[PDB]
Amino acid sequence: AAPKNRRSIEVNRCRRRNPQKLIKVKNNIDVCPECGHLKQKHILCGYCYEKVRKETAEIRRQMGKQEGGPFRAPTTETVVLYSGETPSEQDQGKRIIERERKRPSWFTQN
Amino acid sequence: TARGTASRFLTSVLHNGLGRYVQQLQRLSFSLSRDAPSSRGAREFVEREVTDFARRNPGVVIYVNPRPCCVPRVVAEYLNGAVREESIHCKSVEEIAALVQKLADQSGLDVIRIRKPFHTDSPSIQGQWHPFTNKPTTLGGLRPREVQDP
Amino acid sequence: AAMASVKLQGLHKPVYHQLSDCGDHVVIMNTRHIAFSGNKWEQKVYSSHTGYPGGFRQVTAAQLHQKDPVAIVKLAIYGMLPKNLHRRTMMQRLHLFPDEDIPEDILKNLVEELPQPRKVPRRLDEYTQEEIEAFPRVWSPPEDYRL
Amino acid sequence: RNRIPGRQWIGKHRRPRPVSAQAKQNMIRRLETEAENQYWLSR
Amino acid sequence: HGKSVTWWDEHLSEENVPFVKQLVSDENKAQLASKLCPLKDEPWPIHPWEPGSSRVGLIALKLGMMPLWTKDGQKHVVTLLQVQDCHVLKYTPKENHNGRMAALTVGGKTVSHFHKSASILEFYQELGLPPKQKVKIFNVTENAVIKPGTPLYAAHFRPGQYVDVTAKTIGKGFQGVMRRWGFKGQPATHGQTKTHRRPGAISTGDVARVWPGTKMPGQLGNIDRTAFGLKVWRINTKHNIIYVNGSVPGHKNCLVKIKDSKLPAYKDFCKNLPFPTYFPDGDEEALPEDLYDENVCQPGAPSITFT
Amino acid sequence: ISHGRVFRRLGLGPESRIHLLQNLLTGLVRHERIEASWARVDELRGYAEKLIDYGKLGDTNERAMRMADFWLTEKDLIPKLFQVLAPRFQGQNGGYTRMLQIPNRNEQDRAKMAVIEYKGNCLPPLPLPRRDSNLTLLNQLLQGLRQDQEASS
RNA sequence: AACAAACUCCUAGCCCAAUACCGGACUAAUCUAUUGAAACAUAGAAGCAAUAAUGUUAAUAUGAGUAACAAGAAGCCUUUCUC
RNA sequence: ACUUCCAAUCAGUGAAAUUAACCUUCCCGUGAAGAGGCGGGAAUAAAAAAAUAAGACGAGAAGACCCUAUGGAGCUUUAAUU
RNA sequence: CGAUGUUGGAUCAGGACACCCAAAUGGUGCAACCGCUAUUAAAGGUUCGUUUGUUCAACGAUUAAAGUCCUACGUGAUCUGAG
RNA sequence: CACAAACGCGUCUCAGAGAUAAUUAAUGAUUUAAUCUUAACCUAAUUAACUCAUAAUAAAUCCAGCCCUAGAACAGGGCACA
Ligand SMILES: [K+]
Ligand SMILES: [K+]
Ligand SMILES: [K+]
Ligand SMILES: [K+]
Ligand SMILES: [K+]
Ligand SMILES: [Mg+2]
Ligand SMILES: [Mg+2]
Ligand SMILES: [Mg+2]
Ligand SMILES: [Mg+2]
Ligand SMILES: [Mg+2]
Ligand SMILES: [Mg+2]
Ligand SMILES: [Mg+2]
Ligand SMILES: [Mg+2]
Ligand SMILES: [Mg+2]
Ligand SMILES: [Mg+2]
Ligand SMILES: [Mg+2]
Ligand SMILES: [Mg+2]
Ligand SMILES: [Mg+2]
Ligand SMILES: [Mg+2]
Ligand SMILES: [Mg+2]
Ligand SMILES: [Mg+2]
Ligand SMILES: [Mg+2]
Ligand SMILES: [Mg+2]
Ligand SMILES: [Mg+2]
Ligand SMILES: [Mg+2]
Ligand SMILES: [Mg+2]
Ligand SMILES: [Mg+2]
Ligand SMILES: [Mg+2]
Ligand SMILES: [Mg+2]
Ligand SMILES: [Mg+2]
Ligand SMILES: [Mg+2]
Ligand SMILES: [Mg+2]
Ligand SMILES: [Mg+2]
Ligand SMILES: [Mg+2]
Ligand SMILES: [Mg+2]
Ligand SMILES: [Mg+2]
Ligand SMILES: [Mg+2]
Ligand SMILES: [Mg+2]
Ligand SMILES: [Mg+2]
Ligand SMILES: [Mg+2]
Ligand SMILES: [Mg+2]
Ligand SMILES: [Mg+2]
Ligand SMILES: [Mg+2]
Ligand SMILES: [Mg+2]
Ligand SMILES: [Mg+2]
Ligand SMILES: [Mg+2]
Ligand SMILES: [Mg+2]
Ligand SMILES: [Mg+2]
Ligand SMILES: [Mg+2]
Ligand SMILES: [Mg+2]
Ligand SMILES: [Mg+2]
Ligand SMILES: [Mg+2]
Ligand SMILES: [Mg+2]
Ligand SMILES: [Mg+2]
Ligand SMILES: [Mg+2]
Ligand SMILES: [Mg+2]
Ligand SMILES: [Mg+2]
Ligand SMILES: [Mg+2]
Ligand SMILES: [Zn+2]
């Protein structure tokens, strides 16, 4: 079908500015206690997660160099140790990942 | 049309004509030329009628400023502050006299639509109609179906 | 409705004008006892359509008055007022009551009562004995006839 | 519901518009005037 | 002031979330168990049965369906309706609701306080009951009025009675004209092009419009419906379960409004029934575990012999 | 009418749905923390819960071995499942994995992301939403009720 | 009776409708001859005036942010898997 | 009944026929003879999204049918001239 | 005639009563049964098949009955194209 | 019927009062008979519509998130013991 007449701008403005078609505001925005940036209540902080993801990639990159083959996987548990630390008695019998940087604050040793 | 332009009520400035009549025209300024053929009507008016016009109307001040111009103009100012521009470009002598005489008789208010052809203050002599001006009063002011107190 | 239409519009005020909001409330009581002239109780019909197919309803004047007591008077006025958009506004000022049961709020607002447009004739039992003796006996019936 | 066939003022079938009491008086008033008209022309 | 949205669990600490749940839970049991004496807490006067009187219905939960057999060998299907928490909420005078019959308000099963409106929670606080899920209005004559806060049980209906059922049916969403109204479709293979389930012509040429009553595709299912003339076969006492013949509208685990049948044949069939309702305290006797209709084959009855 | 349907239509059909979750589950076992679309991660949670249940059965049970053969498409992860993941989970019954909503991906599609991981993984902890401390004003007021309640009852 | 016209009186006038064809008086904007010199006058000349040709060119809208278009997954980021 | 491509919501890019102006209702009557616009009556807070195609004598092609034009052309011959 | 798309079916039917059935009743060359005829009533209903492109008609089986007609002889921006 | 559902071929339910047209009968006058009466009063037998009894709907102002036998979007029902 084809339109019969040109829509006037008075009609178009009513349709294009109806409250349904407008952008709704968000009232669930909060400041992250740790870093002070912005995040939603039900969503993890973007800055804090990006902080973790960068560190996780570095740890995984070190693991790749410790298993050259593409089908080599450990048969035991894994523990990550940073500079200035030594494996504990309970941590023995597990593969050791060494990182040169100082242990990050958020990461907690057990 | 009437819906397009503004409107005003019939009003006389400063309650003119009540105690005494004051000619509301204040001054005129003629801007004519001494060489332009289109200013011939203005020049003939100045030589003949301007001197006699000033005598009849001592309440107006007439300024004549012959300067190089192409369209002769006459500017009339009134007491209330309204200035009205006019063009006397290429008009006969008697047409200028009629045009100037008309400017002398105008009150100076804006020439727009007048809503009513009359104006009055306190028109309600001997009272104005209200829905109680012709209804008889009932004994005791009783409503149509009101029960008496006793 | 003829006098009620005038009061609602304001055609009784010498200050009348359609643009102005001049208008007077009218309270009509005892609307169950209206008296249609002639056989209009059975001949006049009020018809309306609900919109849906097969929804054309025609109701006799007697049937409508038996269901909605004030419908006869309200429709009569609703058709006599001017057909502009003010008719809806000025119908809200019309108050109809089937009998003499008026809220005290409405009663305190009244001013005057309009006269009845039709003089109600009185029945035979309402004539006083003085009137009966005053009216002459037109004829003399025979004494031997049995009524 | 009931229609006048064709145009309502021309043809075989027309509108049944009757003569009114006002129209009868207008004819009589003109007739009385013309009755006086033909008397002043008589002599 | 653009105040942020909040919920009950937002600011509660991990050591207090279990505590608050215990706090509200203990309140519900105390409130529910304090209403179990309708005849010991100064109830409204009880009047004897009169012709043309109407009783008070219940709000029950639809469990499922079971087969049931009668003594003549026929098979019937019964729907298990369970009454979980039924209390009369408020009483409306005759002249303030309809002008002919009084209105009694009955609530549904218990729900959580944390997800109801402020006014709804405040209303129940004054009465002293936990919030209800569904609330319905019952038309009751003045001679069968019940004091608000009086509990109701499945024994309110005695087996042998015919009852109605009102509940929202199963919503099937935006369904086409063939499913919604049952129009026949166009043929499938004899050349038909892009037309197999469409309504087809919807009006006539002359009218140049579509009548308001025309059937068109739209919403189907999620509306209120009522089933009439459902006979009550078996009543269970301890679990408060009502067995109704046939199929009742509504999906499983929905709330169903039950009332006495209004059919002309089933009029005045309440003289031999509790009035205005079954009060367990007044009888001072234990009802049977299950109440059976006279035509029902009980599970502990000898097998049918047509001798 | 999708009443009672607990599964989701993903990929090119019912067969592609399994294979999409087969690759995701393989990545989850090897890396112990992966991120994908929220809808696909939600489906993957159900299988990751029950895969550990098959792992607890043992290395000798044939059904567990065949079930782990199909889902672990990389053949060097079967020994890991029966000797690392299964021994680690012996206490809890269903608390095997965590799901949290990662913010939307910084790309055109703007999909809703989620992060799925196994308990006790050898990775930095996620920024979990921490509840209010008991020293807060609202918590302190409520603790007053509990101390008084426990004193009498 | 009353209310009711382009009719007819009343008060001022510049003192009586129209399609094809025909008659007349003025006139917007250009150039030239003399004037004019904060933009005109008397004349002589013309590419001398666009609410209408499914008109031409260019720019804008409406239909419409509608129809329709695309990148297999995870990760250690380019290596393993699913087809 | 169930799947895939469409579909509806979100993010990116974003076209076409069409359009005198529209603040774009129903009924009966009228009328260049089938009215959203006239007359007599009815109905009537304003907008958005998704659907069905009765009407807008819907959109598309200066009707292929039919006739007219001292308008063309192809074919045939016992038309005229050659 | 700078276009009002043309038979029959399919889907959906809106309406009229000059009624085929269902309900009430008068008359009879109406004993009953089966009929003929007239008045009143339009809320609901009015079948499935062989041949023909067929509407129509013939024939088989059945039904309380298989009504007459208008609606662009309804309905192709919903379908069919046998004619 | 290879989903926890949908579906028919399967199962369930389906109503009282008023009111009428033709017609039939009682009482009775113009016409002291008779006569159902566009004569009055009262009253009787009586089509279908139609109207209504009755039934359904019912709480203004928690709502970020998750679930749902609620759903295109938007809405709606749950999230205390589960
Ligand atoms: K005619
Ligand atoms: K249409
Ligand atoms: K034509
Ligand atoms: K019919
Ligand atoms: K007689
Ligand atoms: Mg006509
Ligand atoms: Mg005539
Ligand atoms: Mg649904
Ligand atoms: Mg079919
Ligand atoms: Mg095709
Ligand atoms: Mg097809
Ligand atoms: Mg129409
Ligand atoms: Mg819908
Ligand atoms: Mg689902
Ligand atoms: Mg897809
Ligand atoms: Mg889920
Ligand atoms: Mg006049
Ligand atoms: Mg003329
Ligand atoms: Mg002509
Ligand atoms: Mg010139
Ligand atoms: Mg030109
Ligand atoms: Mg132009
Ligand atoms: Mg065109
Ligand atoms: Mg043009
Ligand atoms: Mg340009
Ligand atoms: Mg646009
Ligand atoms: Mg569109
Ligand atoms: Mg699309
Ligand atoms: Mg988009
Ligand atoms: Mg409008
Ligand atoms: Mg018409
Ligand atoms: Mg009108
Ligand atoms: Mg009109
Ligand atoms: Mg759309
Ligand atoms: Mg649409
Ligand atoms: Mg038009
Ligand atoms: Mg058409
Ligand atoms: Mg067209
Ligand atoms: Mg042509
Ligand atoms: Mg031809
Ligand atoms: Mg010719
Ligand atoms: Mg020729
Ligand atoms: Mg030629
Ligand atoms: Mg040639
Ligand atoms: Mg020859
Ligand atoms: Mg056209
Ligand atoms: Mg047909
Ligand atoms: Mg029909
Ligand atoms: Mg008839
Ligand atoms: Mg019959
Ligand atoms: Mg046709
Ligand atoms: Mg056709
Ligand atoms: Mg087509
Ligand atoms: Mg069509
Ligand atoms: Mg053919
Ligand atoms: Mg007699
Ligand atoms: Mg009702
Ligand atoms: Mg809710
Ligand atoms: Zn942060």
Q: Using the CB atom, is residue A22 less than 7 Å from strand H? A: no
According to DSSP, residue E296 is labeled B
Residues lying with their CB under 5 A of ligand 12, a single-atom ion: E 208
Q: Does A63 touch chain F (CB under 8 A)?
A: no
Is A77–F124 a contact, with Cβ atoms under 8 angstroms apart?
no
Of E228, E222, E232, E60, nearest to E136 by C-alpha is E60
End-to-end Cα, chain C, rounded Å? 45
CA dihedral F9, F13, F15, F18 (to 10 degrees): -30
Which segments within chain A are labelled E, that is strand? 29-31, 38-40, 78-82, 95-99
Distance separating alpha carbons of residues E24 and E116, to the nearest angstrom = 14
**Which residues on F lie below 8 Å from A60 (Cβ)?**
31
From residue E104, give the alpha-carbon distance in Å to each of A53, C69, E147: 62, 32, 9
A81: contact with F, CB 8 A cutoff: no
Sequential DSSP letters for F1-23: --TT--S---TTSHHHHHHHHHH
DSSP β-bridge partners for residue B63: B29
F84 C-alpha to center of ligand 18: Å? Answer: 114
Please provide the DSSP assignment of A8-20 as one string.
Answer: PHHHHHHHHT-TT
Q: Could you tell me the distance in Å between the CA of residue C147 and the C1' of nucleotide J31?
A: 15
Q: Which nucleotide is nearest to F109 (CA to C1')?
A: H11
Residues 50-89 of E, Cβ under 7 A from nucleic strand J: 54, 76-77
What tokens were used for C82? 């001017």
Do F and B touch, counting CB pairs below 8 Å (3 needed)? no
Listing DSSP states for E82-134 in one string gives E--S-BEEEEE-HHHHTSSSEEEEEE-SB--GGGS-HHHHHHHHHHT---BS-
Kindly give the distance from the C-alpha atom of residue F102 to the centroid of ligand 8, in angstroms, as a whole number: 30
Burial (0-12, 13-18, 19+ Cβ within 10 Å), E181: middle
Rounded-to-integer distance, Cα F28 and Cα D17, Å = 96
Q: Which of residues 59-88 of A touch strand G (CB under 7 A)?
A: 60-61, 63-64, 70-71
Distance CA E140, CA E134 (A): 19
Angstrom distance (rounded) from CA E11 to CA F138: 7
Q: Determine contact: A28 vs chain E, CB below 8 A.
A: yes
Give D41: exposed, middle or buried? Use CB within 10 Å, 0-12, 13-18, 19+.
exposed
> Are E261 and E180 within 8 A, CB to CB?
no
Q: How many residues does chain C have?
A: 147
In the numeric block, which tokens belong to residue E44?
């409204």
CATH of the domain spanning F10-121: 3.90.1030.10
B69 touches strand G (CB under 7 A): yes
Residue of chain A nearest F132, judged by CA positions: A33
Residue F107 beta carbon within 7 A of nucleic strand G: yes
CA triple A77-A78-A79, angle to 5 deg: 130
CB neighbours (10 Å) of residue E121?
14
Helix, strand, coil share (%) of chain A residues, nearest 5: 25, 15, 60
Q: Are E61 and E255 in contact (CB under 8 A)?
A: yes
Q: Which residues of F touch E11 (CB under 8 A)?
A: 132, 136, 138-139
Question: What secondary structure letter does DSSP report for E22?
Answer: H
If you compute the radius of gyration of chain B from its CA atoms, what whole number of angstroms results?
A: 27
Q: Where are the domains of chain F?
A: 10-121
Check if the beta carbon of residue B108 is closer than 8 Å to that of residue B82.
Answer: yes
Strand J lies under 7 A from the Cβ of residue E180: no
Q: What b/e readout covers B58-80, taking b as 16+ CB neighbours within 10 angstroms?
A: eebebeeebeebeebebebbbbe
Counting as contact any 3 or more CB pairs under 8 A, the partners of C are B, E
Q: Which residue of F has its CA nearest to A96?
A: F122
Residues 28-47 of F with CB under 7 A from strand G: 30-31, 34-37
Helix or strand holding residue B7 (H, E): strand B7-8
CB count in 10 Å sphere of residue E55:
21
Say how many C-beta atoms besides its own lie within 10 A of residue E206's C-beta. 6
* E5 in A contact zone (CB under 8 Å): yes
Chain A contact for E2 (CB, 8 A cutoff): yes
Contacts of F125 in chain A (CB under 8 A): 52, 106-108
Distance from CA of A28 to the nearest CA of E (A): 6
Compute the distance from residue E204 Cα to the ligand 38 centre, in Å.
19
Strand G interface, B 73-102, C-beta < 7 A? 89-90
What tokens does E231 get? 């006979």
- Resolution (angstroms) equals 3.5
- Residue E173 at interface with chain F, using a CB cutoff of 8 Å: yes
From the list A54, F145, F128, the residue with the least C-alpha distance to E24 is F145
How far apart CA C113 and CA F112 sit, in angstroms, is: 76
**Per the annotation, does D1 bind a ligand?**
no
Cβ distance E5 to A28 less than 8 Å, yes or no, reads: yes
Strand G–CB B29 distance below 7 A: no
Ligand 30 mean position, distance from CA E207 (Å): 21
Residues of chain C with C-beta less than 8 angstroms from the C-beta of B135: 111-112
**Chains A & E: contacts with CB separation below 8 Å:** 9
Task: Give the integer Cα–Cα distance in Å for A77 and F84.
Answer: 6
User: How many angstroms is C1' of I3 away from CA of D12?
Assistant: 35
User: How far does the CA of residue E19 sit from the closest CA of chain F (Å)?
Assistant: 8
Q: Does E11 lie at the interface with F, CB-CB under 8 angstroms?
A: yes
- Contacting residues of F for A71, CB less than 8 Å apart: 74-76
Give how far A14 is from chain F: nearest CA, Å.
30
C98 cis-preceded (ω within 30 degrees of 0): no
- Cα dihedral sign, B108-B114-B117-B119: negative
Helix (H) or strand (E) holding F78: helix F78-80
What distance separates the 2 farthest-apart alpha carbons in chain B? Answer: 102
Q: Residue C45: in which H helix or E strand, if any?
A: strand C45-49
The Cα–Cα gap between C59 and C61 comes to 6
Least Cα distance to E86 among E141, E135, E157, E145 occurs for E135
Method: cryo-EM
Inform me whether the C-beta atom of residue A26 falls under 8 Å from chain E C-beta atoms: no
- Please give the structure tokens belonging to residue C104: 């005290």
Q: Is the CB of A18 under 7 A from strand H?
A: yes
Alpha-helix residue ranges (DSSP H) falling in C79-117 = 86-91, 104-107
A77 near F CB under 8 A:
yes
What is the β-pairing status of strands B61-64 and B25-31? parallel
Please give the distance of CA C127 from its chain centroid, rounded to a whole number.
Answer: 26
Give the up-direction half-sphere exposure of residue C42: CA atoms within 13 A in the CB hemisphere. Answer: 2
CA distance E5 to chain A (A): 6
Instruction: Provide the 8-state DSSP code for E70.
Output: B
**What is the DSSP code string of E128-197?**
T---BS-EEEEEE-GGG---TT-B--GGGS-TT-EEEEEEE-----EE-HHHHH-PPPPPSSSS--S-SS
